[PDB]
Amino acid sequence: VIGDLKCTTVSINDVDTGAPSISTDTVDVTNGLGTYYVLDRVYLNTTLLLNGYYPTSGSTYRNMALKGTLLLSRLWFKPPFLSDFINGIFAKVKNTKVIKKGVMYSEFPAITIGSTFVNTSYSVVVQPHTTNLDNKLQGLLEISVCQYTMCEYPHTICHPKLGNKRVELWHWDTGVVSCLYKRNFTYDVNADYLYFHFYQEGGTFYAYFTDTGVVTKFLFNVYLGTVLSHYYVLPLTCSSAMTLEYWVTPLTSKQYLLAFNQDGVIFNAVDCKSDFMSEIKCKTHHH
Numbered sequence: 001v002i003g004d005l006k007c008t009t010v011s012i013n014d015v016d017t018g019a020p021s022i023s024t025d026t027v028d029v030t031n032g033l034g035t036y037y038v039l040d041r042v043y044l045n046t047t048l049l050l051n052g053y054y055p056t057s058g059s060t061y062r063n064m065a066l067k068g069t070l071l072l073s074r075l076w077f078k079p080p081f082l083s084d085f086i087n088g089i090f091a092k093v094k095n096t097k098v099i100k101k102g103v104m105y106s107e108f109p110a111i112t113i114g115s116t117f118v119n120t121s122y123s124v125v126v127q128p129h130t131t132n133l134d135n136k137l138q139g140l141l142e143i144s145v146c147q148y149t150m151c152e153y154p155h156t157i158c159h160p161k162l163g164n165k166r167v168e169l170w171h172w173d174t175g176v177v178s179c180l181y182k183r184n185f186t187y188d189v190n191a192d193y194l195y196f197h198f199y200q201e202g203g204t205f206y207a208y209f210t211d212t213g214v215v216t217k218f219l220f221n222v223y224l225g226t227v228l229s230h231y232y233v234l235p236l237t238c239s240s241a242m243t244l245e246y247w248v249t250p251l252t253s254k255q256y257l258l259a260f261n262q263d264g265v266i267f268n269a270v271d272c273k274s275d276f277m278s279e280i281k282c283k284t285h286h287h
């Protein structure tokens with residue numbers, strides 16, 4: 001279970017469907033993938049050695065995405081799906097596109113990051129929303145940090161047009177919920193992949209995002225005064241069959257070599273300590 005409130009009793013079983021699959025491709029940071037722009041700092045036509053919360057080049061991704069229709073397993077809401085959140089995570093999220101009657105729909109999983117997922121604690125929720133306005137799909141990423149009464153089996157649903165056997169049910173709060181942060185961010189419904197950095201430092205949670213390149217940009221930060229310990233990528237239920245991807249690899253404090261072009265755009269990155277060839281590159285001066 002995620003939270004400790006039973007929100008549903010309909011079509012819940014104890015079926016084992018397998019563990020999260022591992023990508024055949026490892027973490028590759030060469031083009032800037034896995035890095036983010038430095039907050040309030042513009043570097044132009046230069047190379048920079050700096051410390052941040054980065055993935056490790058050569059390491060693996062796990063596909064944490066879960067998709068069902070009606071039947072949901074209790075095991076989907078336990079480890080290894082419910083996972084540890086230490087320093088942070090880097091995410092490569094597939095924007096699954098589905099076309100029905102001339103309308104393209106955008107679908108990908110929501111994620112929650114918290115400790116106990118009980119309303120005596122704050123939980124981070126990053127959830128997509130879509131609507132069709134004048135035959136053109138609009139997309140929003142809703143990010144909130146609230147004392148949610150999270151459900152035991154939290155899940156989202158697809159756009160109503162694609163068909164649903166279940167209702168959206170990931171928390172249950174009929175009163176006023178205390179939130180430290182909440183707002184909507186736009187996302188490109190036509191993007192192939194969305195990239196995220198989520199990390200914590202000195203009691204402060206940070207979020208970075210992009211869907212227009214491979215280098216993420218600062219969205220927001222919030223002071224919690226506590227340490228987050230777990231993350232969970234929520235199942236998405238839909239009557240339409242589709243394949244979802246939410247690739248996750250951990251972040252740790254690492255020294256990277258970043259290359260910025262004349263416009264201040266990151267075009268190259270080296271994970272200095274990932275192997276000896278990278279160590280050579282970083283030892284050869286550059287800041």
Ligand SMILES: *[C@@H]1O[C@H](CO)[C@@H](O[C@@H]2O[C@H](CO)[C@@H](O)[C@H](O)[C@H]2NC(C)=O)[C@H](O)[C@H]1NC(C)=O
Pocket residue numbers: 129140142182183184
């Ligand atoms: C972000 O945008 C979404 C979608 O417009 C907002 O969610 C709606 O909130 C209203 C008022 O509470 C409800 O009547 C709708 O049912 C909600 N729609 C959906 C799809 O959830 C949300 O309030 C916005 N968040 C913030 C922080 O402004």
Ligand SMILES: *[C@@H]1O[C@H](CO)[C@@H](O)[C@H](O)[C@H]1NC(C)=O
Pocket residue numbers: 045262
């Ligand atoms: C960029 O920096 C390099 C040194 O690494 C220098 O040769 C070049 O003149 C600079 N270009 C611009 C447009 O400032």
